[PDB]
Amino acid sequence: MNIFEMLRIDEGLRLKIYKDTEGYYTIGIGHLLTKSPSLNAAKSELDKAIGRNTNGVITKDEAEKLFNQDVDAAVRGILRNAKLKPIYDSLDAVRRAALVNMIFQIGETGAAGFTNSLRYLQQKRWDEAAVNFAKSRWYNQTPNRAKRIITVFRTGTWDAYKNL
Ligand SMILES: [Cl-]
Ligand SMILES: [Cl-]
Ligand SMILES: [K+]
Numbered sequence: 001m002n003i004f005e006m007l008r009i010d011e012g013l014r015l016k017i018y019k020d021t022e023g024y025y026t027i028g029i030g031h032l033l034t035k036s037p038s039l040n041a042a043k044s045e046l047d048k049a050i051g052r053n054t055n056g057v058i059t060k061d062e063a064e065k066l067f068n069q070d071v072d073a074a075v076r077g078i079l080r081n082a083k084l085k086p087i088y089d090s091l092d093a094v095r096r097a098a099l100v101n102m103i104f105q106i107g108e109t110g111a112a113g114f115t116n117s118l119r120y121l122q123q124k125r126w127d128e129a130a131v132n133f134a135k136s137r138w139y140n141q142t143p144n145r146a147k148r149i150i151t152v153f154r155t156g157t158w159d160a161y162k163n164l
Contacts, residue, residue, distance in 0.1 A: 001158040003071060003097040007104060009164050010145055013063060017042055017056045021142055027056075028063030030104065031070060074104045081108055087118045095121070098152040105145075106138060121153060130154040 011030030017039070020026040025033045025042035033045040043056050050062055058066075078084045078100065088099055099121075103111055111118075113136070120129030130150050133139065139146040151160040 001161055003100055004067070006097055006158075006161055007067075007071065007101055009161055010101060010105075010148070013060070015058055015060065015063060017046065027058060027066075029067040029070075031063070031066045070104060071100065074100050077108055078103055081111075083115070084108065084111060084118070087122050090122050090124075092156055094156050094158060095153055098149050101149055102138075105142075110138065126154045126156075 008029060013029050014027065017025055017027050017033065020030075020032065022035075024035050025039065025045075027033060027046060031049070033042045033049070036042065039056075043054070046056060046058070047054050049066060050058060078088050084099075084103070088096055091099065102114075114133070117129055117132040117136075120126075120132055130153060133150050133153065134146070136146075139150075148160040152158065
């Protein structure tokens with residue numbers, strides 16, 4: 001298990017534009033195109049992203065390409081965020097992957113509201129952090145995925161993904 005395999009499980013792989021759990025145009029492996037309700041707008045974002053006139057469908061390789069970029073950018077942003085870098089640095093590799101996964105899903109902006117949870121992680125108060133994390137719109141809207149992420153923060157193991 002690793003960040004790529006974990007997010008592949010969590011996001012799936014689709015080669016045509018589709019809408020994510022929030023109703024937003026996405027493609028590939030969780031690659032958010034835009035929050036605009038305009039499909040053409042989405043398609044334009046896709047073409048810009050891939051570098052060609054696609055007509056809304058991409059190859060697996062292309063999908064993987066955006067994914068790699070996406071994972072990298074997620075890490076990079078965490079490293080550049082003064083509110084997150086410290087948490088990230090205080091963690092073991094398994095938990096770090098869970099934090100990257102969260103940011104990939106909700107963004108740094110979405111992570112701003114987790115200050116308290118992040119603090120519990122920093123204190124290594126695993127069960128306390130787990131309880132806290134669950135008290136969020138994030139958990140309520142994507143409970144199965146959030147539960148997985150939370151078990152990783154709680155245990156430092158991949159057990160939640162192990163059988164998927
Ligand atoms: Cl992009
Ligand atoms: Cl879910
Ligand atoms: K998805």
